Design a protein around this ligand. Structure first.
Ligand code: GLU
Ligand code: GLU
Lengths: 444, 444
């Protein structure tokens, strides 16, 4: 068990899938390098920047309480109890940043609403979370999957992919995502050959059995995926084992992640993926690349990350001059949303501070007893330009506390020796794509 | 807001859907007469009987803390906080009886496992709840829907109903129930014409739109339903509005309930339903029929129940001689499971009492600090003959804390002037049915 507790005048809770789900029985597995560690560090980086900002919360130091979810909603609920213990060692929590997986964000939201704690997700896209009658303290820097499903149905309609197979991860992301896709597909006269579900529970079929079901309909060469990152790897690995070749059309769960395709680049060649439209935070790259196990002792998972990333041991022995750089690192696509989520919470607290304490820069008596209801409704639904790092760059929430439906379309290609994801299109309300730039496995 | 707090040496928590979900926005609606009030009263009756029993917990008085779930998992979580407050006015809770809907039992279980509180459901049939790695403190007097789905697929296979439509309630009961059915159907060469989902969330279609989808496949005259009681009424009402005629094959969600069919008996004629194999508790009938608003003041919802049931007001004025009797009352099918769940908890506590306090009948020092882990694992998985009321009548749990897969098959018929559900078959591991006794709408 591990955590990050940095004391401050106001403390922000944080939830990241630092570790994957453990195999068989174990709660926690391997370190999730890109969607775990990087995202965690993007929150720490944003907190550091805000604490250096003389225009945003001067006189109010932001502390943190960051916990691992181990990519499980059950594990995340146990961890989330620590954020509410001080309302029932435990510190008071102003707001919560996370989680990543929609199921954990849902579980956490069910608990947090009972303590009027505002919650901002930087990656949870389930349309379920747009229900304000149920998730009254929830907001997100990301859009609902109502739009991603539409974007995917429009891609198939554009290429006349009228007879397709679907595979979905069981849970809050995959099931509602594919249900939304199936409605949009039907409105566009797109038929579904087979609809498979994957996941761990006793009711699911094997990944090899799912691949066998996909090959049983050779007519459907395009497979639409609304799946989790961990489930996506298992499916590809299964496709690779039986040398199954399909044109994968995948949601943000896969996105532009190299971890899903490393080792099985052949079986995933020509894949079309979506990811939320984002731009890299250049200052984060500088910050992340400067981290090493000798200077980073506030992150208790950093040593495990380092040993996994570089295939090492401390006390092959880890070389002292090992460094995170452009040769072994790429900024995770949703980092922009993590920084924006921390900044959204900061801007809402600054505005409440300037309203309730006009006489000081400090946490006045009128603000010591924080009103989560008012913080959420009267402040958090605000407006700001993307955090002192950016060249619609405004951070805001709609009536439902959601971000804007903007996606980038990617194609898994070879470029020039190196396998990568090339941006080949965009979706904002309509689909735009550069068809000539796409490589489909073998030509077409 | 209302509750039942009866102080005792050991207190049992209780969760019942006393009220339906409220329309539009309101949390609570009409009183749920049969699956709400009757079930609540069956727990109170069992507690009264145990407190009169000189062989089961003599010297240990059983108190209660019974709350309304308003047929919502969100509402049930808020109410369940009251059971754990005394571990964080609030009383200590030995075990929890409920809930009814699988989604509420799931939400409650997520919370209770964190406080090592044993939970026994008398009606939650979701196969999800058999996962002991996730629901480690959960047991139930009822079986998982792995069996009901099989029982339903075997009924269709028996009648050569090879091209059917399905309708499922969104949520933990309907979705996994129909997913299990779809696997069993496929193993029996049964094809699914259309698969509709119903429910309240923003993603679901109208009940009228679902009926329109069913009529669009006239070939599929048999419609399989894995749906909640409240959703079942809405679907029938919709079928009745457009005079849609189908052969309904429904899960226990519909069961042998008259409330689902009252007013729309014509559209549901010839329906085949399943319900868990049970026998009425004769002593409960005596107890329930003796209740009136002048003697029942421990139940704060009884006055609302009385006014709804009899179309009354207190201070048409309610006639003082109004009585619950065989002319206006029938024992709810799952009452046996409520009494057994209370008795299961009592027998586990008695056995722990006799093990830790052999010297007394009282709650000794070695038992004042209750160990929920040991209570669940070492005692609750026990053996007893159905509570001093019965003519396999044993109350026990399998390795997964589940009851036995035994179902009764019913047919909605006219009998002789009166519309009712006639038992026409049974499923225990194989299907047995009396085909000649079945009335299908118009002859066949
Ligand atoms: N959008 C995903 C999570 C995104 C991510 O981890 O990159 C979900 O709804 O679970
Ligand atoms: N078996 C149903 C509830 C049973 C009932 O209320 O009669 C469920 O899984 O939700």
């Amino acid at each position: 068990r591990r955590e990050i507790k940095i004391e401050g005048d106001l403390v922000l809770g944080g939830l990241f899938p630092i570790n994957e789900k453990g195999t068989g029985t174990e709660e926690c597995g391997r370190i999730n390098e890109d969607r775990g560690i990087q995202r965690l560090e993007a929150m720490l980086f944003a907190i550091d920047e805000i604490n250096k900002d003389d225009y945003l919360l001067p006189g109010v130091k932001l502390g943190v309480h960051i916990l691992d979810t181990c990519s499980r909603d059950t594990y995340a609920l146990e961890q989330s109890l620590e954020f509410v213990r001080a309302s029932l060692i435990p510190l008071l929590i102003a707001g919560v940043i996370g989680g990543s997986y929609s199921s954990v964000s849902i579980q956490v939201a069910n608990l947090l609403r009972l303590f009027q704690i505002p919650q901002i997700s930087y990656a949870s896209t389930s349309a379920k979370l747009s229900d304000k009658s149920r998730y009254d303290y929830f907001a997100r820097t990301v859009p609902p999957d109502f739009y991603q499903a539409k974007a995917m149905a429009e891609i198939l309609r554009f290429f006349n992919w009228t007879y397709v197979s679907t595979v979905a991860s069981e849970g809050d992301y995959g099931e509602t995502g594919i249900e939304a896709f199936e409605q949009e597909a039907r409105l566009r006269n797109i038929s579904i050959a087979t609809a498979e579900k994957v996941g761990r529970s006793n009711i699911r079929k094997s990944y090899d059995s799912v691949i066998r079901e996909l090959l049983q309909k050779p007519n459907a060469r395009v497979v639409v995926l609304f799946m989790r990152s961990d489930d996506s790897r298992e499916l590809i690995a299964a496709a690779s084992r039986a040398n199954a070749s399909f044109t994968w059309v995948a949601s943000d769960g896969w996105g532009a992640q190299e971890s899903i395709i490393k080792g099985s680049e052949h079986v995933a060649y020509g894949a079309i993926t979506l990811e939320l439209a984002s731009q890299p935070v250049r200052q984060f790259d500088r910050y992340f690349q400067s981290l090493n196990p000798y200077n980073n002792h506030r992150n208790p998972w950093f040593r495990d990350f380092w040993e996994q990333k570089f295939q090492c041991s401390l006390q092959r022995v880890c070389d002292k001059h090992l460094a995170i750089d452009s040769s072994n690192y790429e900024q995770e696509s949703k980092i922009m949303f993590v920084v924006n989520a921390v900044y959204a919470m900061a801007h809402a607290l600054h505005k409440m501070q300037r309203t309730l304490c006009p006489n000081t820069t400090k946490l006045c008596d009128a603000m010591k007893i924080l009103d989560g209801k008012k913080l959420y409704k009267d402040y958090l639904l605000k407006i700001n330009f993307t955090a002192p790092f950016n060249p619609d760059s405004i951070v805001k929430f709609d009536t439902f506390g959601d971000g804007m439906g903007r996606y980038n379309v990617f194609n898994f290609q070879n470029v020039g020796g190196k396998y990568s994801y090339l941006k080949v299109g965009h979706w904002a309300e309509t689909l735009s794509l550069d068809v000539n730039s796409i490589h489909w496995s073998r030509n077409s």
